[PDB]
Amino acid sequence: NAIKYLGQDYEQLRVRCLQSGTLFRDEAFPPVPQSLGYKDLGPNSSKTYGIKWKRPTELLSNPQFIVDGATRTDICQGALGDCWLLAAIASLTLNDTLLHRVVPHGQSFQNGYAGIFHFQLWQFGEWVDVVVDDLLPIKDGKLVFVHSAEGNEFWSALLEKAYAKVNGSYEALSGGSTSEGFEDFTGGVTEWYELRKAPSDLYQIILKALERGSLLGCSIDISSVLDMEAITFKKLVKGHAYSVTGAKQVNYRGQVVSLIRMRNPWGEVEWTGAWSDSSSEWNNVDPYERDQLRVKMEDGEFWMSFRDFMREFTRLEICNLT
Ligand SMILES: [Ca+2]
Ligand SMILES: [Ca+2]
Numbered sequence: 001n002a003i004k005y006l007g008q009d010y011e012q013l014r015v016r017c018l019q020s021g022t023l024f025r026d027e028a029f030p031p032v033p034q035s036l037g038y039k040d041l042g043p044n045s046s047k048t049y050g051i052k053w054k055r056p057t058e059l060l061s062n063p064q065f066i067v068d069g070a071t072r073t074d075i076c077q078g079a080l081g082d083c084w085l086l087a088a089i090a091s092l093t094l095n096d097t098l099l100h101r102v103v104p105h106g107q108s109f110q111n112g113y114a115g116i117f118h119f120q121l122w123q124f125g126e127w128v129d130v131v132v133d134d135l136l137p138i139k140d141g142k143l144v145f146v147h148s149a150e151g152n153e154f155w156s157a158l159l160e161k162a163y164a165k166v167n168g169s170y171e172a173l174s175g176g177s178t179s180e181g182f183e184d185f186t187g188g189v190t191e192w193y194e195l196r197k198a199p200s201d202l203y204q205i206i207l208k209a210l211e212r213g214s215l216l217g218c219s220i221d222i223s224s225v226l227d228m229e230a231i232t233f234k235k236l237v238k239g240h241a242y243s244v245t246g247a248k249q250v251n252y253r254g255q256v257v258s259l260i261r262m263r264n265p266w267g268e269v270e271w272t273g274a275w276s277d278s279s280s281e282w283n284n285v286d287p288y289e290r291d292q293l294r295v296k297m298e299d300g301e302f303w304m305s306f307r308d309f310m311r312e313f314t315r316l317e318i319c320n321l322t
Contacts, residue, residue: 002120005130005166005282010118013131018097021114023055026133029165036137037171047079051144053135055115056154063109065117067153070103072245073299074156076267078145080175085163086146086265087217087241088185088319089156093222094245095213098321103155119162122187131163137170145170149267149299177219178239178317186215188320201305202256206316207247214320216244218262222312236312237264244303244316248293251284259293260309264300275303 004010004053017024022183029035031053031270056063067074072090093099096269118131126159135156137144146160165169175181179190191209193202195218209216222228222239230238246261260273275281277297282290293303304312 002127002129003124003199005123008131010116010129010131014112014114014116017114017116018112024131026131026165027113029132029161031133031135035164035169037169037174038067038169039057040170041080041171041172049138051139054138055134056136056152056157057109057113057115057134059138059141060152062152063154064110064150064152065107065155065158066103066105067148067150068101070105070155072263072301073267074148074150074153075265076149078143078147078301079139080145080170082160082163082170083147083241083265084175084177084179084182084217085173086160086186087177087243087263088215089159090243090263090265091215091245093216094210095236097213100147103159105295109154117158119159121162121166122184123166125184125187128166130166130284132158132161132165134158134160151211158236168321177217177239178315186319187322188214191316191318191319193316193318195202195313195316198310198316202310202316203260204246206244206260209318209320210244210247215320216316216318217241217242218309218313218316220312234271235269236271237266237269240267242313246303247306248270250289250293252281253284259303259305259320261301261303263302267300268298268303270298270300271304273304274307275306277302281305 036048070093072093075086075090077086107117115134118129120127121130143157146156148156164173176177219241220238228239243263245263250257282294
């Protein structure tokens, strides 16, 4: 049904490997310096020094494709500036049908393992099935790029690998917090908002985008590279893409307050202002609202008020489907 990237046929390649008692080695994306990168991850780079390509089945006795669902907690940025892509993947997990397109859930390391996995990527303006072998860059016994908070989980590492594959290298995934040089992730129309000059009904726009399963991301702009990925006083990261993962209205001190939830794809480092995990704003909402929305954990995810949100962040991007 879906076009096969480069004519590679997952099931056909899988059984060939099974029947010959072997593990898949992708010719289309070899475990080689050029697959890593071309400059910062380039030949002989100190960043790539000591990298080896190892299967999860070499690292562990119990590797898992999916552990407790394929969720946003499974997206932790490694040593690669692919924050926009990782933020989009985190947002994609919130969309159940789209997630089950992109990440075929049947796959595992247990039954019929041949060192091969596949994903359905939006490429050339259609759904494209992409195979990968499960060799992944490792440094000091750990994944170099995206990892899950669950150490034996590999769907996201493998998904990032498929993206690296269709772009020719991992470094090719790097860049800015915007869709700079990144083709359609979604195919539908992309909406862009400068937050200081937003439509008066922006909160409702965000809310309805989330409800219909669009992907939302936001970032703070920069001019020079000396303040690139610079950390704010209240611990926001500049020039870095965040997933917008939720929006809720609360009754705060008797008044309707609009709140917005976002996730740093680092899976750590969070806003410390009003509505943060440990902030006192939660003492002034209905205790049951509090219990329902607040989660006290260093997980990259946090709430802000929508007003503080539009003050702090420069832009919101919405990626719609077809
Ligand atoms: Ca998981
Ligand atoms: Ca948190």
